[PDB]
Amino acid sequence: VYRNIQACKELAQTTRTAYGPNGMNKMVINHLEKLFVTNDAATILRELEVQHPAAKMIVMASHMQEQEVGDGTNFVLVFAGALLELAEELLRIGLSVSEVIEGYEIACRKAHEILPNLVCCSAKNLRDIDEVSSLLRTSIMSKQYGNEVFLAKLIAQACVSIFPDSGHFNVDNIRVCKILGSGISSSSVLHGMVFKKETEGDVTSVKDAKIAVYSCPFAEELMNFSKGEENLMDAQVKAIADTGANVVVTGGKVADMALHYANKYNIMLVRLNSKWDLRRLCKTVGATALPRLTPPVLEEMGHCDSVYLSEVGDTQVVVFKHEKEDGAISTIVLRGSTDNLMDDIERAVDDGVNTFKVLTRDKRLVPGGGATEIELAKQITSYGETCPGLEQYAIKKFAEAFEAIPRALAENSGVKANEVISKLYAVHQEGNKNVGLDIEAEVPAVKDMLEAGILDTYLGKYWAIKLATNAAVTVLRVDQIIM
Amino acid sequence: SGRKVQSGNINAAKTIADIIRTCLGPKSMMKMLLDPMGGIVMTNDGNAILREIQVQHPAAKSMIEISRTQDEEVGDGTTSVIILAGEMLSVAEHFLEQQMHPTVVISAYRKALDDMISTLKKISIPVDISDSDMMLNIINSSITTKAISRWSSLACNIALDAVKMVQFEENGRKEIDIKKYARVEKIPGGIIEDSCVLRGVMINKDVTHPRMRRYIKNPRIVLLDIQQLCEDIIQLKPDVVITEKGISDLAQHYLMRANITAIRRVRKTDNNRIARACGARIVSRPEELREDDVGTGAGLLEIKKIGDEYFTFITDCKDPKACTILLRGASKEILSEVERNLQDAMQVCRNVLLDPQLVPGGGASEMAVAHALTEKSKAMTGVEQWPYRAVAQALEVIPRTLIQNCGASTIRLLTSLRAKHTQENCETWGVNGETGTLVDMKELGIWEPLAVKLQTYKTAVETAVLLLRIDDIVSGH
Amino acid sequence: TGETIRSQNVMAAASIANIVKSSLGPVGLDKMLVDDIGDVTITNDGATILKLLEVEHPAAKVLCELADLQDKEVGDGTTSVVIIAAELLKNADELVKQKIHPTSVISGYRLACKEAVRYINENLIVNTDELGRDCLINAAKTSMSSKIIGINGDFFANMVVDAVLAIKYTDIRGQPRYPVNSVNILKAHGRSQMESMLISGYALNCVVGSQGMPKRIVNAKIACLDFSLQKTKRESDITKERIQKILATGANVILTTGGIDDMCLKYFVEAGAMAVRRVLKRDLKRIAKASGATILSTLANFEAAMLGQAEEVVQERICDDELILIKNTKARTSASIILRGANDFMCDEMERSLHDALCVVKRVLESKSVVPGGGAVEAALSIYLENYATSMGSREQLAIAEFARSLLVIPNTLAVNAAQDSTDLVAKLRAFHNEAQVNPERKNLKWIGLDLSNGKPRDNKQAGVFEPTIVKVKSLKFATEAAITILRID
Amino acid sequence: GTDSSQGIPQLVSNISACQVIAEAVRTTLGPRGMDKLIVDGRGKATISNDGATILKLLDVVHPAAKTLVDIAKSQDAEVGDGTTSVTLLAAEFLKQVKPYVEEGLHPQIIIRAFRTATQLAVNKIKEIAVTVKKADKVEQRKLLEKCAMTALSSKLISQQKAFFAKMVVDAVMMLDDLLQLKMIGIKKVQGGALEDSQLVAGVAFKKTFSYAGFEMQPKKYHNPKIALLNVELELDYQAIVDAEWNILYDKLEKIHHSGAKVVLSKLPIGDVATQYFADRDMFCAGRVPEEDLKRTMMACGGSIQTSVNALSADVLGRCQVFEETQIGGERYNFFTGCPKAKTCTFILRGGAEQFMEETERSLHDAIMIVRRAIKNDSVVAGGGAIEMELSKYLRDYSRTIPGKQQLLIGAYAKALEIIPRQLCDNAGFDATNILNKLRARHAQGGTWYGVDINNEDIADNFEAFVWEPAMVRINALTAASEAACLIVSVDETIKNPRS
Numbered sequence A: 001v002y003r004n005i006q007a008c009k010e011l012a013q014t015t016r017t018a019y020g021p022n023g024m025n026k027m028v029i030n031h032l033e034k035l036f037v038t039n040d041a042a043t044i045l046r047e048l049e050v051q052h053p054a055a056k057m058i059v060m061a062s063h064m065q066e067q068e069v070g071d072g073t074n075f076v077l078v079f080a081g082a083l084l085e086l087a088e089e090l091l092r093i094g095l096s097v098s099e100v101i102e103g104y105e106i107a108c109r110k111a112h113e114i115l116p117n118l119v120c121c122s123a124k125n126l127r128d129i130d131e132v133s134s135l136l137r138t139s140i141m142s143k144q145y146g147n148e149v150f151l152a153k154l155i156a157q158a159c160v161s162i163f164p165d166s167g168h169f170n171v172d173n174i175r176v177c178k179i180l181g182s183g184i185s186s187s188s189v190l191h192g193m194v195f196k197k198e199t200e201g202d203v204t205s206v207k208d209a210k211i212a213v214y215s216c217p218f219a220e221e222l223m224n225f226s227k228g229e230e231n232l233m234d235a236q237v238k239a240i241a242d243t244g245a246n247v248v249v250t251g252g253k254v255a256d257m258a259l260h261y262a263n264k265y266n267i268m269l270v271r272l273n274s275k276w277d278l279r280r281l282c283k284t285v286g287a288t289a290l291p292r293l294t295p296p297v298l299e300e301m302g303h304c305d306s307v308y309l310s311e312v313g314d315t316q317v318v319v320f321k322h323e324k325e326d327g328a329i330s331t332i333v334l335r336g337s338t339d340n341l342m343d344d345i346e347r348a349v350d351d352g353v354n355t356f357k358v359l360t361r362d363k364r365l366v367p368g369g370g371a372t373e374i375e376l377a378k379q380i381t382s383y384g385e386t387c388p389g390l391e392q393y394a395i396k397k398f399a400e401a402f403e404a405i406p407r408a409l410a411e412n413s414g415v416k417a418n419e420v421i422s423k424l425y426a427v428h429q430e431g432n433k434n435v436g437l438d439i440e441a442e443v444p445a446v447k448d449m450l451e452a453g454i455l456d457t458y459l460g461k462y463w464a465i466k467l468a469t470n471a472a473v474t475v476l477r478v479d480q481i482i483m
Numbered sequence B: 001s002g003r004k005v006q007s008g009n010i011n012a013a014k015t016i017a018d019i020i021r022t023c024l025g026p027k028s029m030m031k032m033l034l035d036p037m038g039g040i041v042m043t044n045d046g047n048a049i050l051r052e053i054q055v056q057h058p059a060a061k062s063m064i065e066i067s068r069t070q071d072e073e074v075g076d077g078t079t080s081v082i083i084l085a086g087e088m089l090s091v092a093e094h095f096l097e098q099q100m101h102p103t104v105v106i107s108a109y110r111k112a113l114d115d116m117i118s119t120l121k122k123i124s125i126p127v128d129i130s131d132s133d134m135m136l137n138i139i140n141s142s143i144t145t146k147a148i149s150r151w152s153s154l155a156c157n158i159a160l161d162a163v164k165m166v167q168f169e170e171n172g173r174k175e176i177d178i179k180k181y182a183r184v185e186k187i188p189g190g191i192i193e194d195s196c197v198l199r200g201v202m203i204n205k206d207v208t209h210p211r212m213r214r215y216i217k218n219p220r221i222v223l224l225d226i227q228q229l230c231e232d233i234i235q236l237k238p239d240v241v242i243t244e245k246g247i248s249d250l251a252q253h254y255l256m257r258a259n260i261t262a263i264r265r266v267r268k269t270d271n272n273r274i275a276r277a278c279g280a281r282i283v284s285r286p287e288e289l290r291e292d293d294v295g296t297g298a299g300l301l302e303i304k305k306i307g308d309e310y311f312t313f314i315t316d317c318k319d320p321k322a323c324t325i326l327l328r329g330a331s332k333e334i335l336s337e338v339e340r341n342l343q344d345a346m347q348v349c350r351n352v353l354l355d356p357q358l359v360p361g362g363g364a365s366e367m368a369v370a371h372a373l374t375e376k377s378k379a380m381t382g383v384e385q386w387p388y389r390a391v392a393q394a395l396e397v398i399p400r401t402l403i404q405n406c407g408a409s410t411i412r413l414l415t416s417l418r419a420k421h422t423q424e425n426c427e428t429w430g431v432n433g434e435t436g437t438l439v440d441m442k443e444l445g446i447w448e449p450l451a452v453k454l455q456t457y458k459t460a461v462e463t464a465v466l467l468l469r470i471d472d473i474v475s476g477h
Numbered sequence C: 001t002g003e004t005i006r007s008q009n010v011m012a013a014a015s016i017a018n019i020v021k022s023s024l025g026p027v028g029l030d031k032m033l034v035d036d037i038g039d040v041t042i043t044n045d046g047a048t049i050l051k052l053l054e055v056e057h058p059a060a061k062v063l064c065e066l067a068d069l070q071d072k073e074v075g076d077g078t079t080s081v082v083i084i085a086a087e088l089l090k091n092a093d094e095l096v097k098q099k100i101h102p103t104s105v106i107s108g109y110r111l112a113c114k115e116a117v118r119y120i121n122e123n124l125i126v127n128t129d130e131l132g133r134d135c136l137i138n139a140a141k142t143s144m145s146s147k148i149i150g151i152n153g154d155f156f157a158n159m160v161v162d163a164v165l166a167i168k169y170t171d172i173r174g175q176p177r178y179p180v181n182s183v184n185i186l187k188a189h190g191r192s193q194m195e196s197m198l199i200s201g202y203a204l205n206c207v208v209g210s211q212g213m214p215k216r217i218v219n220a221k222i223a224c225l226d227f228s229l230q231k232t233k234r235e236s237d238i239t240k241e242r243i244q245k246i247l248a249t250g251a252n253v254i255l256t257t258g259g260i261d262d263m264c265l266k267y268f269v270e271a272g273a274m275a276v277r278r279v280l281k282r283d284l285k286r287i288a289k290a291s292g293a294t295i296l297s298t299l300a301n302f303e304a305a306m307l308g309q310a311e312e313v314v315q316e317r318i319c320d321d322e323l324i325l326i327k328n329t330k331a332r333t334s335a336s337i338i339l340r341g342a343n344d345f346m347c348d349e350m351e352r353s354l355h356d357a358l359c360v361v362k363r364v365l366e367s368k369s370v371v372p373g374g375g376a377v378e379a380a381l382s383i384y385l386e387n388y389a390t391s392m393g394s395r396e397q398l399a400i401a402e403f404a405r406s407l408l409v410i411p412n413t414l415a416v417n418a419a420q421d422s423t424d425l426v427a428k429l430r431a432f433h434n435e436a437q438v439n440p441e442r443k444n445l446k447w448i449g450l451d452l453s454n455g456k457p458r459d460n461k462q463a464g465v466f467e468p469t470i471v472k473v474k475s476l477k478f479a480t481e482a483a484i485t486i487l488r489i490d
Numbered sequence D: 001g002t003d004s005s006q007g008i009p010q011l012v013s014n015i016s017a018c019q020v021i022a023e024a025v026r027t028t029l030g031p032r033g034m035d036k037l038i039v040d041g042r043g044k045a046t047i048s049n050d051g052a053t054i055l056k057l058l059d060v061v062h063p064a065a066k067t068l069v070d071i072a073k074s075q076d077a078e079v080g081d082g083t084t085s086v087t088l089l090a091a092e093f094l095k096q097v098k099p100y101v102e103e104g105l106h107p108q109i110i111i112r113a114f115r116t117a118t119q120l121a122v123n124k125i126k127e128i129a130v131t132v133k134k135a136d137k138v139e140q141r142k143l144l145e146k147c148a149m150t151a152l153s154s155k156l157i158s159q160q161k162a163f164f165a166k167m168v169v170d171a172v173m174m175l176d177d178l179l180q181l182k183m184i185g186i187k188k189v190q191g192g193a194l195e196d197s198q199l200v201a202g203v204a205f206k207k208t209f210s211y212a213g214f215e216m217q218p219k220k221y222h223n224p225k226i227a228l229l230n231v232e233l234e235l236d237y238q239a240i241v242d243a244e245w246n247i248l249y250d251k252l253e254k255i256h257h258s259g260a261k262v263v264l265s266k267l268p269i270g271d272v273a274t275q276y277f278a279d280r281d282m283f284c285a286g287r288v289p290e291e292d293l294k295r296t297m298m299a300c301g302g303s304i305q306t307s308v309n310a311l312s313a314d315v316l317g318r319c320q321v322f323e324e325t326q327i328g329g330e331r332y333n334f335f336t337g338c339p340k341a342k343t344c345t346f347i348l349r350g351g352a353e354q355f356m357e358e359t360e361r362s363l364h365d366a367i368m369i370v371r372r373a374i375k376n377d378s379v380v381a382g383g384g385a386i387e388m389e390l391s392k393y394l395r396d397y398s399r400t401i402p403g404k405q406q407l408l409i410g411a412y413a414k415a416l417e418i419i420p421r422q423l424c425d426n427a428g429f430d431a432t433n434i435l436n437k438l439r440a441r442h443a444q445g446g447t448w449y450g451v452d453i454n455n456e457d458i459a460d461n462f463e464a465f466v467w468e469p470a471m472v473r474i475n476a477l478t479a480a481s482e483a484a485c486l487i488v489s490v491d492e493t494i495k496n497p498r499s
């Protein structure tokens, strides 16, 4: 039993250092020898060889937390490790393993109703670009560097604010065309599906287009074989060019007589598609995957509207746009020098836009950064002495676990945790809810979080304090496996 | 090194505490010790365990040493100080693992100490002065669950007369009591009812040829440590002059010429009690031999052959501060325990002379200071808050060990006890040491006196701050 | 393995300071000092820790005597002269590993200490003058901080600086001396410490000699003795004839340290004298030297003029205590604050806080040239010797900075022992002493040091936290003397 | 036997790993840096003094070393030289911040202090930046020739380096379209004195057996161009000889029909068949380098061919003139006279063989220095004077700021000082005197006192025209700080093997 919660403690400790906006990034040289200098907990959890079975419940609860808000994973891990760390103290006091379960359940049910009573929600809409750019600041502020978020919150928001329309949203439409080279300031916004191409013979102002679909990319007897191959690729590009295609796509490289054919019929020779856009370009234009050059027809065809060349990001790229939604797809172009920061920027983008998605359905915003956690830590520990019996222990061991969350925010910022926790707990008694932990001060100084703007989603905390408690309870109710 | 050997200090202090943890209270489990020779000895008394036991660590030695200073002042409870220091020292390391200094910990411990000395005086119930019924209740609380329960009916009187004959009116009204002037004489032979009290000092020794002008109706005792000086004495003419060496019968007649009675082979616990009961003095230098020579002492000398023994009673004395208590019987195993527990009770009724307060023990005083310090912990902020609260709940092992060694569970019992102590503020309930049930200790009657438990709590806090003050033992191992 | 015996000596000398590091300052911890005979030792000061330590390494044994050479000058500073010299060895070994010769580091240290004392002698204080008194007031308030005297301790501070300066002895060379046992503790039962007052003499709480002496018996000639004036049977019957032989010589206030005279109060209206039992020698000798008297065990013999001067012996009630008012004497060895309270036991730590204030006030009085406390001299010197080092350009240039980086260990230690983080306090002292140099208008910003009780930046010239300049100067001399020897040893 | 995978052991292992890879490139800093020899393993001896030429050919096994060698790879893509300086500076940042970490200070604090110190330094470098453009550098160009003189000043080569300075300013000025190392090659010629060198306006290549066919080609020709062929030219048992004879016939007739002056190929032509492929009736060439392939197509413009009688429009199209001359005795290829002339090749006419190494160490940065002094004008001094001024500024900024960063910014300060300390150690002087006498008059007199590489005494590199580009130093110390805080921010390295 104690070995299980010890495995949960070390699983909490390996992600506690990567918590908050000053998370220490870890190095991943994985099974197939990657190289990630990364900070997101779901990236590390999907790489770590979780061998102990009791920690797999914690990993699965964090994965379920990822599956519906996209964030709050490290919060679930830290809170569950804190609950089990205080649970072993409760067990070594002399409480049963049953009593801690319903104590945690009662205090979690109390937290689930105290949590909507501290909200400072969003103002009017997920429109008004400059208002919701500040609302998306906290997500990438936690992940990437804070001084970088001032451009990055705008770049991540002005593209995602294209379609906050008719009460429905999709996060898959926000893509990234990862283009290397110039700095992060050179990043820009694009409206439609974008990737680089090679050639130039593009008809631009097309109607509802006719898109080629590729699921698989590319003495006189010698001259006769040459003419045979010549008319062979001619009939091949005609087998696409019949039924009137405007573009010819391929995942690979150019061919010289084939590009002369694509200039002869005036077709855009699209090249160099990824091993992931083969589904995504089919999804956006209504295309069905075709292996070779011979078997397209008019029924076997995609339908964009405007395919031409753009030079934003200082590089020639394609554009696919104006679908049934007429603005369904809206990628972003992310410019960096190397790749080892660009994966973190990419994993910050979607973790910003899923918070935008949960803001479509939950406008409630709680003050984050120690404000909510110390408030719950005070409320439940004031509830704890009210109900007598053995649960009076366990409820008081619940809210104290909430104090482990700003402590992990404290010690990740070079701050003495006991001083800042005592100071925050004292100032929360009178200078109420909206105060929390300041990051920038080396001195353990508190700061009001509402005027700082550092607020989190209410539904994320609401689901996270449910799933972490469920994980801790379902871990505490096992004894062993023969192993 | 440093905090590592500080943790080693508190570990070496805690291990000797859990050695003697279970053996407090009236249901004490017996700790057995073997030598590397074959001596197999079982006991309950914690001090008896502390005497033989060796410790390889100087921190544990000093922790033992301050309790060794504690034993000879107010008496027992020396297991309680070694217990109650250890939990504070163990709970201090949880903040020493929080990278906070020993200084904030010991200042929080001192801030708990000044609270604990006050809150015990809040819950102090006044016993009345020298009223024999609650004086019997003092015997009922302090002297029972021992081997005196068939002979405490005499010990209740032996307490009450001895405390009234060891008083000292130095700065005020009779305030200092003492246990070294009460003239105990524990001789076997006869029934234990022959153990009697009287005013004065008995002396086992006598002159070897008692054809002397020996007993005079107002013996004025001069001490000495020569017939020319015997001639020189007769300026003021005292009637007795005390030596310690042998007096021949010719020298006895020559002292009869002076009319003074000397004495031989007398002990020093005899001699200082002789001088204490009478106000003796000593001088033989002739220009210091003045009006200031003779200590006007007793009102009766008495050659008495008590138990065929050459007794001399210096009784009806000057100062009622060294007075007779005989101790008779068959063997010498229980009136020694009577003497021990009644010198502890002598300090008890010394407290009754000064602060006559009987606070409910059995952890009820401990639960009261615990609750009254937890509620005071709610207002205070700063880093010293958590250690200050820690000794709020580190010290409650006095019920927790006592509920441990009586069969009942500790968890539900202590949780229900604090449940009937926090919101039930004016109750002061304690765990009964027999059935393991939460009773009103005021209804049960087991009241520990205030000053002795104040001394134990203070000495425990001093032990804690002494150990945490220690940094390193670098002069050897 | 093992190499560079200089580094072996550096580690051996560094271990000695690592023992006595956390003991620096009044909030220092305790070092258990145990030989295997069984005995323990509980002590906080580096002097006896350095003395009774069974020291092992021979190169480290060069330290304990050189710091003992600090002991025979002023006493304390023995810990700091170990700590500073060990940090000098630590930085000097790092300089040695950069192929800088130990001769060059030693010559740089020898330039640095002379430049440091030249910097110190242009920035010390003599402001604690005859009219500079409130500095002594809050300097006494430093000795009684965080105590319950603090609301009456200003009223105590006025009377205690009036105690020490009025009792002051102009010595044989003219410099003022304070005998510490001259003014002494003296309890009074009854009302609390709100009313305790300095009396300009001693006033003994023993048996009353006489009301027969007048309210100001103008020439109190102290005919003190040791006998008890009791009759036996120019006297053998020792009550009168010796004291009458000296009494015709103008013996004004007879004192009998033993018993009283039998015809006492009748001789006490023609002489105006006393007979007080148990006159302790703390007050008997310090009324003898207060007046210039002679105590006569035997008296049969001159004895006219050597019964020294006092001006009046008052017979009144002082806080439920008629006292023996040996007061207004020839020399000022007679003063006592009548400690009103219950005993010397209810105000025991209170009279401790009243006595230690005297001996911490006396330190600035001897050798009136003074520097601030709180380690601010070391912070100012680290500011100083940095820019002094950057002017050199020789091979000693890296030495003096390693001098200046070493000296700030004394605020670095005191920040640790006062339960603070050691970085920010020393950094704040360095920042505050920057504008003591780089800003010409704020020259009155030098005196910011660490408070030894809390560990925070705080003025010391305004607060009285001071140190005699010869202590700082000679400790900085002897630290370099300890550094140069062990750096030469290889 | 030492196990180090906990957090403080993690960072200690990481900084030992950066220290060893810094020692792998420590001695190569500066113009006269010590050479390092590595092999491939099979006998391909490579002596190098460059950093990335060492570092790419080096091995790297460690995680933190791999996540700094990427920054090292990023620094060579700008200009090349300077990759050792940024890595050595970041390693000295880590070695100076070393004793503060295990004493108990937080890595995010020292990272933030590094960032603030970097922002302060990149501020202070901008104010001391001096432009030198209109002080007669392109018109009356001789002062820009003067910094062209800074490559080999006051040597026995310096008299010939007057001609080399004039020709390097010509090799920059005549071709400035953001010039590269590719557009200007150097060609070694044995024999003669070093003064007899040249800078030709075109390509230059020695001809060997498999290289080129026969002399007496149309040298003085109005428009001599190139066929760029990828087919060979060289020479059933009765039905296999006549087909080869016919192929010989049509490949002979291709030269008449297509009209190619010199056919170019990556395929061998027979010089044992010299007149036999002069019986191709024209010149040809084979086994071509890629610099010849570019600089005669991107600059001259010779078209590329495919078949038996492959005619094109640029086998005798517009180039200026052909040349084939005994330069130093040996006749060389010259498809000189390029209409798109980003091609002027240096012709190292000289006696000794290892002076090729001397010129490819000394004039391979002189092209960079001169084309940068044209490209950048806001420049600063070198020789470690700029790091010394930033170290003085940040030494002031440390003690004038309260808080724990004061010890770190000074740690940011002294860590700069190994940049000239490694320089003089690569020169040979004592670092201690050359640093102390530097810092004294640097803190008293002025800023741009720097370390001279020749006499090893403190000089004024601003007056010796030793210009360092301000933007290059900005990117250098920015990348040094970034590679510092990346390794400092790294604690955990999760492995998760195969098995």
Ligand SMILES: Nc1ncnc2c1ncn2[C@@H]1O[C@H](COP(=O)(O)OP(=O)(O)O)[C@@H](O)[C@H]1O
Residues within 6 Å of the ligand: A019, A020, A021, A040, A041, A070, A071, A072, A073, A074, A075, A138, A141, A142, A143, A351, A368, A369, A370, A437, A438, A439, A454, A455, A456
């Ligand atoms: N600048 C900041 N100031 C205060 N708190 C912050 C800041 N940035 C992030 N946080 C807090 O860190 C907490 C954890 O976020 P994190 O777990 O890193 O998100 P994710 O689960 O997407 O990685 C959030 O609840 C947020 O309140």
